[PDB]
Amino acid sequence: KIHPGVAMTVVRTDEILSENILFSSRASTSMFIGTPNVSRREARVDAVTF
Amino acid sequence: NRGLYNMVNEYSQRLGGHPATSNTEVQFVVIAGTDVFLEQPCSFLQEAF
Amino acid sequence: PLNRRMQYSYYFPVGLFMPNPKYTTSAAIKMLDNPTQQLPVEAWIVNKN
Amino acid sequence: KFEVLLGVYTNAIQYVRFLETALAVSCVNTEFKDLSRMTDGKIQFRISVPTIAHQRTFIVVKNCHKHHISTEMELSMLDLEILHSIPETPVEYAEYVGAVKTVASALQFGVDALERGLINTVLSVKLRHAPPMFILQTLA
Amino acid sequence: PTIAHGDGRRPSKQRTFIVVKNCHKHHISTEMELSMLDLEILHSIPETP
Amino acid sequence: GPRFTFFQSSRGHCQIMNILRIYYSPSIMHRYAVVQPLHIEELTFGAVACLGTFSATDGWRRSAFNYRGSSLPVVEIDSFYSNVSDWEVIL
Amino acid sequence: MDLKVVVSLSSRLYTDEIAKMQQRIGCILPLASTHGTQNVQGLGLGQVYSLETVPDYVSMYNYLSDCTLAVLDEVSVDSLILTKIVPGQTYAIKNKYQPFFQWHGTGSLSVMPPVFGREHATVKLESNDVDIVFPMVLPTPIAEEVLQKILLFNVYSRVVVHMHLGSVSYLGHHYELALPEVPGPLGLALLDNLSLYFCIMVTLLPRASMRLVRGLIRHEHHDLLNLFQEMVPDEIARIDLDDLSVADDLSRMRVMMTYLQSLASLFNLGPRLATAAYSQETLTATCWLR
Amino acid sequence: EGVENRPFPYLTVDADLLSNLRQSAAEGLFHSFDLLVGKDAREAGI
């Protein structure tokens, strides 16, 4: 427990779970909504996956 | 150790973490349950203040 | 999505050494040691709890 | 003697329309029926900047960016073969009704997951262009 | 319900829980006493005050 | 005596003989150490065969098989597409 | 059945990267998942083949057999679409690969990690800061020649003849290929299994065929016999001193043909494509997965 | 498990029953439950 001939500066990172607040102004972004088209992916032998 | 909500129901339902008795001159171990109402945080979180 | 995890960075030195004209801006600390011949060897950190 | 069944219950899954929440105050919407055929979308801005006597126009372009989202509902081959066929006996009608309720509930769940993923993509793209507060307190 | 996502993730195909809840059945019993001395006179009719 | 094991994998046949040789790596030297293969036909450490494909997500849900007396654990692969193959020897 | 995987890029894409990707339309690309939409990470062979100096080809094979396969048909800005290759369907796969291997009529195609360089079959995407590389698709005999040339350079590395091994030769052109130095534990595990196979071959190999070829070299000269340079090897001399017996030979061949099928399946790494009716005028082939 | 998977006239109520449900049921708050995901999420045959 003697001191060595050198020192150290211990850096670490600490994660903090926050509860954010998002503001956004009116008419900031114009967006086009598409069409919800349905499909068939896989005809597995007992269940078909849409 | 197993489960967390079932630990809460184990805490609330019958609550036998082997507590001591009451209204005796020296504390014994209680055997007859749900007659004296107890509550044991030490039997839940295993520490001491 | 809003409950995000910001992570900061903390840093602290361990075992530094003051220059030789030492001093103290306190009153109620008395250490049984020769004050001009003491240096740290460990650093004490407070935990999350 | 008897065992009693004190009523079955279920949640009525409320459909959450994108305009039924106030996130749609942030965004003006247009039903564009051919977004699969939209390879690009751009917007020109001619900003005329005046001067102060003790002339500039900053032509900037902003481009759109598509967002493809899709979940995967799954339906068995039982309640399609029993769905396409015709029921005759009342037990098969009580089965066929359950099959069509399963299929309609899965399809309604699919469009419900799409209309929730729309809000998720809106909430994400409103995060992607959102610098934090301590920067824009000084920058503004 | 779930959320359709842009990134390729393992999609939860229409999860549905079927939970049950058993009833708690417990009876209450009082034990009211009634002497037969003021019960045998309940059957007859009075004729003297 | 011989053994009949069952392997679920999400890989190719080229991968499956390599990883099954690696899985049987103690057993081959076990059979070699207790019995010297004195002839030429005892070299084959059995063979494998693909029984077919199924979905990698909801595969192999564990269940139980009850007889009248007892009950053993048994896997339950659901929605199997059976496709047998010839025997590929392990060595 | 609908096989259409749209991969949304998380950023934009410049016109030079668009024009470079648009030349590689119809080339086979692997994917991370098999779902509807995907992000750009996991696409291509680039996640296992990093931008380094050291390659490892067998790990890319273990990737390729694990992942699915798709064909690149539409690429746009901010999103490019892919068409999956599921077994059971029949696809039109165009020959849009720059080292031009001419394809056989109804032969068999074979996918492959990029043996002719990283920079040769790639697109640099600085905009999404990742790299999409393209797996080589070449016919199966030339694929076997490339695979055995890689393994032969892996075994001859402690010996040295280099350019006689480090360059494939096809009738269209002979090509150089990138030669690494060590495949790590996986290529050595493949060589370990092939060493087991080769050593058990030289255990159970018959002796009457050596007695055939020893007199046959002394009898006949052939292009199957010119590589011995009219010198019977000494092992043929010190094995053919024994007699000939047909019963032990039929016992030996019943393990020889038993092991050679599994040795054939020790070269089926990487998924294989069974093609049909390849037209040499449109460079496409009606092909399906084997 | 005592859960019956039979079809039923399921009365639809409006209370938010699934308020942190999957992390509750995976930890086993309920005495006996059944999770049906995908092809088993249908009505059973009579």
PDB file of N, CA, C and O in Angstrom, chain A residues 3-33:
ATOM      1  N   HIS A   3       2.767   4.328  -2.130  1.00  0.00           N
ATOM      2  CA  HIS A   3       2.483   5.010  -3.379  1.00  0.00           C
ATOM      3  C   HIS A   3       3.533   4.631  -4.411  1.00  0.00           C
ATOM      4  O   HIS A   3       4.723   4.595  -4.087  1.00  0.00           O
ATOM      5  N   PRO A   4       3.145   4.346  -5.643  1.00  0.00           N
ATOM      6  CA  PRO A   4       4.126   4.116  -6.700  1.00  0.00           C
ATOM      7  C   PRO A   4       4.670   5.454  -7.177  1.00  0.00           C
ATOM      8  O   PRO A   4       4.312   6.517  -6.681  1.00  0.00           O
ATOM      9  N   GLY A   5       5.530   5.394  -8.180  1.00  0.00           N
ATOM     10  CA  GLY A   5       6.159   6.610  -8.645  1.00  0.00           C
ATOM     11  C   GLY A   5       5.365   7.352  -9.695  1.00  0.00           C
ATOM     12  O   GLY A   5       5.927   8.163 -10.433  1.00  0.00           O
ATOM     13  N   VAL A   6       4.059   7.101  -9.768  1.00  0.00           N
ATOM     14  CA  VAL A   6       3.237   7.629 -10.844  1.00  0.00           C
ATOM     15  C   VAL A   6       1.786   7.639 -10.382  1.00  0.00           C
ATOM     16  O   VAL A   6       1.407   6.933  -9.447  1.00  0.00           O
ATOM     17  N   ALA A   7       0.977   8.474 -11.017  1.00  0.00           N
ATOM     18  CA  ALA A   7      -0.426   8.614 -10.675  1.00  0.00           C
ATOM     19  C   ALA A   7      -1.285   8.227 -11.865  1.00  0.00           C
ATOM     20  O   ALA A   7      -0.799   8.031 -12.979  1.00  0.00           O
ATOM     21  N   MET A   8      -2.584   8.121 -11.623  1.00  0.00           N
ATOM     22  CA  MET A   8      -3.512   7.782 -12.683  1.00  0.00           C
ATOM     23  C   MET A   8      -4.777   8.607 -12.532  1.00  0.00           C
ATOM     24  O   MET A   8      -5.166   8.979 -11.423  1.00  0.00           O
ATOM     25  N   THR A   9      -5.402   8.906 -13.664  1.00  0.00           N
ATOM     26  CA  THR A   9      -6.639   9.676 -13.711  1.00  0.00           C
ATOM     27  C   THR A   9      -7.718   8.773 -14.279  1.00  0.00           C
ATOM     28  O   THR A   9      -7.825   8.603 -15.493  1.00  0.00           O
ATOM     29  N   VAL A  10      -8.522   8.205 -13.389  1.00  0.00           N
ATOM     30  CA  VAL A  10      -9.469   7.161 -13.749  1.00  0.00           C
ATOM     31  C   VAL A  10     -10.654   7.796 -14.455  1.00  0.00           C
ATOM     32  O   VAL A  10     -11.451   8.494 -13.832  1.00  0.00           O
ATOM     33  N   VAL A  11     -10.784   7.535 -15.740  1.00  0.00           N
ATOM     34  CA  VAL A  11     -11.921   7.991 -16.527  1.00  0.00           C
ATOM     35  C   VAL A  11     -12.905   6.837 -16.657  1.00  0.00           C
ATOM     36  O   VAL A  11     -12.507   5.678 -16.814  1.00  0.00           O
ATOM     37  N   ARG A  12     -14.191   7.139 -16.518  1.00  0.00           N
ATOM     38  CA  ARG A  12     -15.233   6.140 -16.683  1.00  0.00           C
ATOM     39  C   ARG A  12     -16.453   6.803 -17.293  1.00  0.00           C
ATOM     40  O   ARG A  12     -16.571   8.028 -17.309  1.00  0.00           O
ATOM     41  N   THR A  13     -17.366   5.986 -17.802  1.00  0.00           N
ATOM     42  CA  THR A  13     -18.615   6.486 -18.350  1.00  0.00           C
ATOM     43  C   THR A  13     -19.794   5.940 -17.569  1.00  0.00           C
ATOM     44  O   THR A  13     -19.821   4.765 -17.200  1.00  0.00           O
ATOM     45  N   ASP A  14     -20.766   6.809 -17.324  1.00  0.00           N
ATOM     46  CA  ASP A  14     -21.923   6.483 -16.511  1.00  0.00           C
ATOM     47  C   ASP A  14     -23.174   6.709 -17.336  1.00  0.00           C
ATOM     48  O   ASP A  14     -23.402   7.816 -17.830  1.00  0.00           O
ATOM     49  N   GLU A  15     -23.977   5.665 -17.481  1.00  0.00           N
ATOM     50  CA  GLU A  15     -25.193   5.730 -18.274  1.00  0.00           C
ATOM     51  C   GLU A  15     -26.358   6.189 -17.407  1.00  0.00           C
ATOM     52  O   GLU A  15     -26.558   5.675 -16.304  1.00  0.00           O
ATOM     53  N   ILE A  16     -27.125   7.151 -17.905  1.00  0.00           N
ATOM     54  CA  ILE A  16     -28.248   7.713 -17.168  1.00  0.00           C
ATOM     55  C   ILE A  16     -29.496   7.564 -18.016  1.00  0.00           C
ATOM     56  O   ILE A  16     -29.558   8.092 -19.131  1.00  0.00           O
ATOM     57  N   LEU A  17     -30.487   6.854 -17.490  1.00  0.00           N
ATOM     58  CA  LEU A  17     -31.756   6.687 -18.185  1.00  0.00           C
ATOM     59  C   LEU A  17     -32.611   7.922 -17.945  1.00  0.00           C
ATOM     60  O   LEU A  17     -33.105   8.136 -16.835  1.00  0.00           O
ATOM     61  N   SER A  18     -32.793   8.732 -18.980  1.00  0.00           N
ATOM     62  CA  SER A  18     -33.530   9.975 -18.841  1.00  0.00           C
ATOM     63  C   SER A  18     -34.952   9.818 -19.363  1.00  0.00           C
ATOM     64  O   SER A  18     -35.322   8.799 -19.945  1.00  0.00           O
ATOM     65  N   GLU A  19     -35.760  10.855 -19.160  1.00  0.00           N
ATOM     66  CA  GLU A  19     -37.132  10.916 -19.663  1.00  0.00           C
ATOM     67  C   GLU A  19     -37.213  12.172 -20.518  1.00  0.00           C
ATOM     68  O   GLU A  19     -37.423  13.267 -19.997  1.00  0.00           O
ATOM     69  N   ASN A  20     -37.049  12.017 -21.824  1.00  0.00           N
ATOM     70  CA  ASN A  20     -36.880  13.181 -22.672  1.00  0.00           C
ATOM     71  C   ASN A  20     -38.209  13.870 -22.954  1.00  0.00           C
ATOM     72  O   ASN A  20     -39.290  13.331 -22.714  1.00  0.00           O
ATOM     73  N   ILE A  21     -38.107  15.095 -23.460  1.00  0.00           N
ATOM     74  CA  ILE A  21     -39.239  15.874 -23.943  1.00  0.00           C
ATOM     75  C   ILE A  21     -38.914  16.295 -25.361  1.00  0.00           C
ATOM     76  O   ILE A  21     -37.909  16.975 -25.590  1.00  0.00           O
ATOM     77  N   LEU A  22     -39.754  15.905 -26.308  1.00  0.00           N
ATOM     78  CA  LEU A  22     -39.579  16.283 -27.700  1.00  0.00           C
ATOM     79  C   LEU A  22     -40.617  17.330 -28.057  1.00  0.00           C
ATOM     80  O   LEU A  22     -41.821  17.077 -27.951  1.00  0.00           O
ATOM     81  N   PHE A  23     -40.151  18.499 -28.460  1.00  0.00           N
ATOM     82  CA  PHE A  23     -40.999  19.523 -29.040  1.00  0.00           C
ATOM     83  C   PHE A  23     -40.823  19.504 -30.549  1.00  0.00           C
ATOM     84  O   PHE A  23     -39.764  19.141 -31.055  1.00  0.00           O
ATOM     85  N   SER A  24     -41.878  19.875 -31.267  1.00  0.00           N
ATOM     86  CA  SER A  24     -41.790  20.063 -32.706  1.00  0.00           C
ATOM     87  C   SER A  24     -42.844  21.072 -33.124  1.00  0.00           C
ATOM     88  O   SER A  24     -43.990  20.991 -32.674  1.00  0.00           O
ATOM     89  N   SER A  25     -42.454  22.013 -33.976  1.00  0.00           N
ATOM     90  CA  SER A  25     -43.327  23.101 -34.378  1.00  0.00           C
ATOM     91  C   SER A  25     -44.377  22.613 -35.369  1.00  0.00           C
ATOM     92  O   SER A  25     -44.278  21.525 -35.939  1.00  0.00           O
ATOM     93  N   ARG A  26     -45.394  23.445 -35.574  1.00  0.00           N
ATOM     94  CA  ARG A  26     -46.472  23.111 -36.493  1.00  0.00           C
ATOM     95  C   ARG A  26     -45.985  23.178 -37.933  1.00  0.00           C
ATOM     96  O   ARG A  26     -45.240  24.090 -38.303  1.00  0.00           O
ATOM     97  N   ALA A  27     -46.391  22.176 -38.726  1.00  0.00           N
ATOM     98  CA  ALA A  27     -46.139  22.092 -40.168  1.00  0.00           C
ATOM     99  C   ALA A  27     -44.647  22.104 -40.481  1.00  0.00           C
ATOM    100  O   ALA A  27     -44.202  22.704 -41.460  1.00  0.00           O
ATOM    101  N   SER A  28     -43.870  21.449 -39.627  1.00  0.00           N
ATOM    102  CA  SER A  28     -42.438  21.368 -39.847  1.00  0.00           C
ATOM    103  C   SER A  28     -42.088  20.431 -40.986  1.00  0.00           C
ATOM    104  O   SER A  28     -41.054  20.620 -41.635  1.00  0.00           O
ATOM    105  N   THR A  29     -42.929  19.441 -41.255  1.00  0.00           N
ATOM    106  CA  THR A  29     -42.577  18.387 -42.190  1.00  0.00           C
ATOM    107  C   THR A  29     -43.820  17.958 -42.947  1.00  0.00           C
ATOM    108  O   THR A  29     -44.817  17.576 -42.335  1.00  0.00           O
ATOM    109  N   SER A  30     -43.762  18.033 -44.269  1.00  0.00           N
ATOM    110  CA  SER A  30     -44.825  17.503 -45.103  1.00  0.00           C
ATOM    111  C   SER A  30     -44.491  16.065 -45.455  1.00  0.00           C
ATOM    112  O   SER A  30     -43.365  15.765 -45.861  1.00  0.00           O
ATOM    113  N   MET A  31     -45.460  15.177 -45.287  1.00  0.00           N
ATOM    114  CA  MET A  31     -45.246  13.767 -45.546  1.00  0.00           C
ATOM    115  C   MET A  31     -46.386  13.218 -46.381  1.00  0.00           C
ATOM    116  O   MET A  31     -47.533  13.653 -46.265  1.00  0.00           O
ATOM    117  N   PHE A  32     -46.050  12.256 -47.227  1.00  0.00           N
ATOM    118  CA  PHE A  32     -47.019  11.541 -48.034  1.00  0.00           C
ATOM    119  C   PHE A  32     -47.208  10.152 -47.454  1.00  0.00           C
ATOM    120  O   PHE A  32     -46.234   9.432 -47.234  1.00  0.00           O
ATOM    121  N   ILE A  33     -48.454   9.787 -47.195  1.00  0.00           N
ATOM    122  CA  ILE A  33     -48.793   8.468 -46.684  1.00  0.00           C
ATOM    123  C   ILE A  33     -49.126   7.581 -47.870  1.00  0.00           C
ATOM    124  O   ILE A  33     -49.960   7.940 -48.707  1.00  0.00           O
TER     125      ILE A  33
END
